[PDB]
Amino acid sequence: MSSKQFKILVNEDYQVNVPSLPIRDVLQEIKYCYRNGFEGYVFVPEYCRDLVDCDRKDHYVIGVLGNGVSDLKPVLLTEPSVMLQGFIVRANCNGVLEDFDLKIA
């Protein structure tokens, strides 16, 4: 009752240059996405985090933290947490579908 399931395109193949945002705007964007879904976003697993580049490495993207029901939290591309599952980023590339159980940190 306290999380939501989403079908998100998973990118394991393509280098993507993605936008990043000030922390206040990523918090708002996480809230928007939790309510409205992740159209226009892909999930990049942490095991292929090298696929992601941003021009503003001082700003944030959507992080997926924890196994099972994961928390959505603003992260930097440096994020070294061992619970980092991946990033949810704006991108247009191909991929495969996976289900995610997410809630707002």
Automatic annotation (TrEMBL):
| Top-level taxon | Viruses
Annotated localization? Host cytoplasm, Host perinuclear region; Host endoplasmic reticulum-Golgi intermediate compartment; Host membrane
Domain CoV Nsp1 globular residue range list? 2-105
Assembly state and interactors? Answer: 3CL-PRO exists as monomer and homodimer. Eight copies of nsp7 and eight copies of nsp8 assemble to form a heterohexadecamer. Nsp9 is a dimer. Nsp10 forms a dodecamer.
Q: Which family does it belong to?
A: Belongs to the coronaviruses polyprotein 1ab family.
Q: What does this protein do?
A: Forms a primer, NSP9-pU, which is utilized by the polymerase for the initiation of RNA chains. Interacts with ribosome signal recognition particle RNA (SRP). Together with NSP8, suppress protein integration into the cell membrane, thereby disrupting host immune defenses.
Q: What is this protein called?
A: ORF1ab polyprotein
User: Source species, please?
Assistant: Transmissible gastroenteritis virus (TGEV)
